[PDB]
Amino acid sequence: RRPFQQKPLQLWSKFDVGDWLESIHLGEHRDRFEDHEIEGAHLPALTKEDFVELGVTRVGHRMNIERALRQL
Structure with a gap:
C-alpha cells in the first residue's frame, strides 16, 4: 500500500507521482519527474513537449x- 492510493490526484506530492509512476510500470521516469517537481495537480496538464x-x-x-490518468 502507498499514499497515492489514498488521496485525490490534486493532493499528490512529487513523491506520490513517483509512487504512481512505478505502480503503472514506469519507475524509470521517477527520478526525472521528481527533479522537475511534477505534482499530481500537474499530471493532467502535461503537453507532449513537457513529456519530452x-x-x-x-x-x-x-x-x-x-x-492511467483517466482511470483516476
Missing part, C-alpha cells in the same frame, strides 16, 4: 501515462 522534457520520449509511455 521529462524524458518520456516513447509514444507508448505517454499513452500509458494517459490511460
Whole structure:
C-alpha cells in the first residue's frame, strides 16, 4: 500500500507521482519527474513537449501515462 492510493490526484506530492509512476510500470521516469517537481495537480496538464522534457520520449509511455490518468 502507498499514499497515492489514498488521496485525490490534486493532493499528490512529487513523491506520490513517483509512487504512481512505478505502480503503472514506469519507475524509470521517477527520478526525472521528481527533479522537475511534477505534482499530481500537474499530471493532467502535461503537453507532449513537457513529456519530452521529462524524458518520456516513447509514444507508448505517454499513452500509458494517459490511460492511467483517466482511470483516476
